[PDB]
Amino acid sequence: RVARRGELLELAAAMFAERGLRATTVRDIADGAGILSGSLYHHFASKEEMVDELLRGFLDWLFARYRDIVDSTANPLERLQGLFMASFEAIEHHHAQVVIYQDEAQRLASQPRFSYIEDRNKQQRKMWVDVLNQGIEEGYFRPDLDVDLVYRFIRDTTWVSVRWYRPGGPLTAQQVGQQYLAIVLGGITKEGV
Template identity: 50%
Template sequence: MQSKDLTGNGPRSTGGAVPSRREELLATAAEVFARQGYDATTVREIADAAGILAGSLYYHFDSKESILDEILSGFLDELWTGYDAVLGAGLGPRATLEALVVESFREIDRHHDAVAIYQRERHLAGQPRFGYLAESMHRFEHIWQGTLERGVAEGEFRADLDLRLAYRFVRDTVWVAASWYRPGGRHDAAEIARQYLGLLLDGIAAH
């Protein structure tokens, strides 16, 4: 099982490589969890969606909890790898915010179902096995609100911003996209990020 490496050193996507049977099963389980919810989903339903017997699923995973753990930790490993690359680039506050938004939409595109699960199952952060979810949420807030604070201090963002409110607005409007964005749709992740940043930073009024 993947380690929950939140320092950004976790494994990334293999790109064009043919997915393994394990990866296919994880993708199927993620789709079922995202659609039905974790608690409402049974191992048999995952197996049925994958076209195998329930007992065969246990050849790859020891429990439904292990499947969810691997889905979420894999998504977060990749997210933090991308975020850490942005933060290590030495960009100014506005450029950092823009790059974080772009990376976020990329991850929504790559891990659409995992993002939906992450949004829906946050209560699991209180369980010992999923404690890394709470750590990730805290780190996410620190990075995004810190970027906004730095932008105000350096004169790149408005001085009258309510930073807490601005952080919550940016956080929620980025990640809620998982509820309506579908990979392969009319707009790709890069275009969605471009449109979003235009609205966020320049507004909708004609100048």
Template identity: 50%
Template sequence: MIPVPKTTPKTTPGKAPGNAPKTAPRTARSPAGGGAASDGRRAELLAIAAGVFAAQGYDATTVRRIADEAGMLAGSLYYHFDSKESMLDEILSAFLDELWAGYEGVMAAGLGPRETVEALVTASFREIDRHLDAVAIYQREARQLASSQPRFGYLADSQRRFERLWLGTLERGAAAGVFRTDLDLRLAYRFIRDTVWVAASWYRPGGQHSPEEIARQYLSMVLDGVTVRE
């Protein structure tokens, strides 16, 4: 059994802390009480937007299309969001926030290298299951966004943090004699990373395999290979 702590919602933002919470519409004085009422609508709209972004690509998605899907007019979206870009921003940063919450839970558990890898991969597949659209969008757009728009600098930050976390784990494992030492670890890192996340391109929630089951099989291949061991 792979012990993965339930996604403990510590405060571990993927985005640098201090960013605006991005919750309330741009009212002069937003209503007291946390705005729990309109938050539902916001989340709903973001989910719709994420779906369209994931299906058509961010650039190819028109704001009118999102509005159509939401049963409103294009202009009405601007009551809830500043821009198309800010929708994308919220989708991606919400995803990264959750992802990192999960990862930190794993790291806090103090597991051995192999168990850490298993837990991280499992957590990743869970995140793919929960944030499929966001993951797909991330895969397609992150590189370009991170490199050309300061606003999305946190994507590059997250990337770097991600690499440190994984490389560190692999190095620990290699040093401990758990992982092979004849591999280029950077290559191995990319191998595992891509292996996991690209799954978002074909994974459909509610399908044949649960995220955990997929994680188990992926881990089995990654850790032990696809050939028969004599």
């Protein structure tokens, strides 16, 4: 789930995601785990340190996926398809971490503890802009796309569904991602329209 310490991190993540980081105290977490605060402090020095481990594990997992996808695909279309679907994998299997990132990363990024957030932000943009540029150059994508805008569109659409997606529901995040991807690639209009 989180991309004894691991069990505690899982519980803390769920609580952070549901209630918000700042609204969650160490006492809250310790009580949730049915343990004393002193015992929780045998695993983590602070709630800030907990979020740090959560976001690091999440981003390390995600950018490892990106790497594997980039390495294993044969052209920019295959690559973009794989990279696009990775966010929905994250939504399905690392939901708490995704929600925590969405809700807290921008605020946290100004603290030295979380300097890696902007590092990864830069790395992800370069990744997307590179695949878009290569896809336009080789003729997989429309030639007059505004690459920065399409990057924005993709960044928006790969993660925006976490705001409404329900984990226990009928549609899986994968199915949502496949349909979202279909629109990104081919739009909603019929050929000839």
